[PDB]
């Protein structure tokens, strides 16, 4: 059967405004593997986002890292939009600098 | 290094 992704949104390094960083969205625990993961900046989809190669865990559920280089500022809000067969609407997780 | 030709289910 199907399994809903867990979603973590975070930066590679502790955020400092004006310092280059990487914005990560980690999705895991999901099945099947078909999924779309987009990164938003103030609600707009970021254009160049890369991802890891599809792998999976001991219980066979999938995981992927989507990431993009970015420079945080005070006013820009970032979120991750996960589109999956188990979600009747896409889940949007906001970036929290301490999570 | 990967494994060689599997049988077939």
């Amino acid at each position: 059967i199907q399994r809903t992704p867990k979603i973590q949104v975070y930066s590679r390094h502790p955020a400092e405004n004006g310092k280059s960083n990487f914005l990560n969205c980690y999705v895991s625990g999901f099945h099947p593997s078909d999924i779309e993961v987009d990164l938003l900046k103030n609600g707009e989809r970021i254009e160049k986002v890369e991802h890891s190669d599809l792998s999976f865990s001991k219980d066979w559920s999938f995981y992927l890292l989507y990431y993009t280089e970015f420079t945080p500022t005070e006013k820009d809000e970032y979120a991750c939009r996960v589109n999956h067969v188990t979600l009747s609407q896409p889940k949007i997780v906001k970036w929290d600098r301490d999570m | 290094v990967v494994g060689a030709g599997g049988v077939g289910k």
Binding site: D53 | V7, G8
Partner: protein, 274 residues
């Protein structure tokens, strides 16, 4: 310490969207080093760690054709298993395969594995003796008999105790400088009031390798197992990992909580107190 090499294959049928998709990745411990993606442009097995690049072109030739061979077999199996289960061609289905070998701290063979799933559920797996199989359901028993008849286990056991450990040892040596490193976690604590009477303490482990780690909260020296929010260990993106454990505490009582961090790169485990 101990070491592992593992390959993960995923084959996904997509009726009405083309031929099945095949993705293969190979790990040494928590480090990916090869990738094959059937949708990608190269149609080649590709390096994903700097140290695998010192293999000569015959390596990439041989790896590419063996991976391609497995995807080919998977395509056959997608059709076959559909028969076993009387499923229509309109549906997407998924075959997953994981196999590999472990060696001890001295490069000696420890364990071999090979397991297969269908649609996310155990289908058939090789037993620890590397000579018998365990079928998960009725359909997999048909495969079990096919594979007993073809002595698949002995092909598989010869690989697991032979080439698999040999090249695992080889990769461990050629990538010694990154694969046999330990980066210990960089730890810190954050603290945020939630109300006039409660606060969150969050314990952070950053920049560590390998991924295995334990974070535990204690109160006056008693594990707080039930009341801690703990996130899955996650990739930073640069080869290292991150993890945190958080606990809601009464405002004013923070000094009773300790976060304990165990990781193999730590000579002794760390204790953090706000």
């Amino acid at each position: 310490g101990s070491h592992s090499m593992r390959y993960f294959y995923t084959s996904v049928s997509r009726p009405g969207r083309g031929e099945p998709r095949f993705i293969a990745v190979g790990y040494v411990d928590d480090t990916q080093f090869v990738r094959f993606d059937s949708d990608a442009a190269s149609q080649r097995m590709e390096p994903r760690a700097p140290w695998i690049e010192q293999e000569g072109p015959e390596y990439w030739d041989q790896e590419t054709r063996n991976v391609k061979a497995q995807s080919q077999t998977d395509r056959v199996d997608l059709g076959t298993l559909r028969g076993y289960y009387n499923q229509s061609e309109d549906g997407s289905h998924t075959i997953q395969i994981m196999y590999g070998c472990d060696v001890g701290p001295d490069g000696r063979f420890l364990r071999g594995y090979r397991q297969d799933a269908y649609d996310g559920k155990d289908y058939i797996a090789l037993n620890e003796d590397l000579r018998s199989w365990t079928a998960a359901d009725m359909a997999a028993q048909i495969t079990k008999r096919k594979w007993e008849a073809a002595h698949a286990a002995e092909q598989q056991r010869a690989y697991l105790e032979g080439r698999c450990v040999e090249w695992l040892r080889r990769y461990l040596e050629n990538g010694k400088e990154t694969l046999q490193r330990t980066d210990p976690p960089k730890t810190h604590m954050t603290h945020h009031p939630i109300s006039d009477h409660e606060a969150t303490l969050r314990c952070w482990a950053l920049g560590f390798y390998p991924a295995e780690i334990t974070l535990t909260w204690q109160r006056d020296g008693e594990d707080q197992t039930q009341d801690t929010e703990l996130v899955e260990t996650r990739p930073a993106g640069d080869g290292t990992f991150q993890k945190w454990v958080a606990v809601v505490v009464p405002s004013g009582q923070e000094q009773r909580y300790t976060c304990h961090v165990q990781h193999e790169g730590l000579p002794k485990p760390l204790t953090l107190r706000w």
